[PDB]
């Protein structure tokens, strides 16, 4: 294409942009044998992302960027039921079934037709199909072979859809467990590998233990009391234990919920009242409430302490609960 | 009533002495790079409405 020479200079060094038979451009990381795509709309999206390197912590960064992507991709308009019906309509039930470009295109069309019928003024089917194919083959097509697995695509869509966190957990467990509902080390490892293929695409894989899924499986099966197989309830409990390699999805759910939160409080640095979004309350001092705008920059008022405990309200508070925790912090400061 | 008036004066002392509080001095201690963050974290926060529009 004529845009190859024009936009090959948008990135430099080892990155090597190449075109695909489906006329979608993609970069090449040749010695890692890993490849990623970059559409011009996703190019400007990533350029906007690159200015948002101000997040101090890891999980917050991943959740905020993934929320920005999901809202930009308009895949937050997709529910669990529509995606499940679309995947069951194309008979993509075997997790190890090879998937060509055409089957993914058909399933994406099935999803996005319903999405546009619900969001005529918000969803454009061909552009959204191109964007979602771009992202999915970014995550799970690093080899440029045109073949992916049904399980990885299912995991990506279910994680990036609009549904309850435990509902997505249960569906993914059913996808990876057998007909008896049992999951051994290998299926859990495959699911964790598919999950860890996501942060490496953006560049925050090492902060959560790297790409080594073995410690995660070891922790999960140690919580399983060394059981040969794990169950859905034990999987949910271990997930609520907030492991290192999976906390990003509940952090995403929280930030999505708190995006519409409005707290009647004042920021104890930038004096912003009312607090909109995330409210953070210190568990040591009194009358100290900070907004996430100053929290993410790392600026601290009155300095930190030997220990500086913090609670993170993501929803408008209940007066009973905050009076209880105020009584707790008075009790703590009394001692 | 003298004790009562003394307590009322004690109330008025911090009622008027506080005079709200400043924010520019906290900006002064804030690094200008952190102030650059303050714009960006507010830019996407104020873009929440344009998240719904888009």
């Amino acid at each position: 294409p004529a845009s190859q020479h024009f936009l090959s200079t948008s990135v430099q060094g080892p990155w090597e942009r190449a075109i695909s038979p489906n006329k979608v451009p993609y970069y090449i990381n040749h010695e890692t044998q890993t490849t990623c795509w970059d559409h011009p709309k996703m190019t400007e999206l990533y350029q906007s992302l690159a200015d948002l390197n101000n997040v101090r912590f890891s999980a917050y960064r991943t959740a905020m960027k993934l929320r920005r992507l999901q809202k930009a991709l308009c895949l937050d308009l997709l529910t669990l039921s529509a995606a499940c019906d679309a995947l069951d309509q194309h008979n993509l039930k075997q997790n190890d079934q090879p998937m060509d470009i055409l089957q993914i295109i058909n399933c994406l069309t099935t999803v996005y037709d319903r999405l546009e019928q619900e969001h005529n003024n918000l969803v454009n089917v061909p552009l959204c199909v191109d964007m979602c194919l771009n992202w999915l083959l970014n995550v799970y097509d690093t080899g440029r072979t045109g073949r992916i697995r049904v399980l990885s695509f299912k995991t990506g869509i279910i994680s990036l859809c609009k549904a309850h966190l435990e509902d997505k957990y249960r569906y993914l467990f059913k996808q990876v467990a057998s007909s008896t509902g049992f999951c051994d080390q290998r299926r859990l490892g495959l699911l964790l590998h598919d999950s860890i293929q996501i942060p490496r695409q953006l560049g925050e894989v090492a902060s959560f233990g790297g790409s080594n899924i073995e410690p995660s499986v070891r922790s999960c099966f140690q919580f399983a009391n060394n059981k040969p197989e794990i169950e859905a309830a034990l999987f949910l409990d271990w997930m609520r234990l907030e492991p290192q390699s999976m906390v990003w999805l509940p952090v995403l759910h929280r930030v999505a919920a708190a995006e519409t939160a409005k707290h009647q409080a004042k920021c104890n640095i930038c004096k912003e009242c009312p607090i909109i979004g995330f409210r953070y309350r210190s568990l040591k001092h009194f009358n100290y409430d900070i907004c996430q705008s100053c929290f993410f920059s790392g600026r601290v008022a009155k300095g930190h302490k030997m220990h500086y405990p913090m609670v993170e309200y993501c929803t408008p508070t209940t007066s009973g609960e905050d009076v209880r925790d105020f009584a707790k912090v008075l009790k703590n400061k009394f001692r | 009533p003298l004790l009562v008036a003394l307590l009322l004066a004690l109330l008025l002392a911090y009622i008027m002495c506080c005079r709200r509080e400043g924010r520019l001095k906290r900006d002064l201690a804030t690094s200008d790079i952190q102030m650059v963050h303050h714009c960006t974290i507010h830019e996407n926060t104020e873009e929440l409405r344009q998240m719904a529009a888009s």
Partner: peptide, 29 residues
């Protein structure tokens, strides 16, 4: 990029009024 608005002088004048009425009525009692 600093925009916060809460009526503060109205709060001080309200506290002033509450204070003076407290003084006056306790004196009356």
């Amino acid at each position: 990029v600093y925009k916060v608005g809460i009526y503060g002088w109205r709060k001080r004048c309200l506290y002033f009024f509450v204070l003076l009425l407290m003084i006056l009525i306790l004196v009356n009692l």
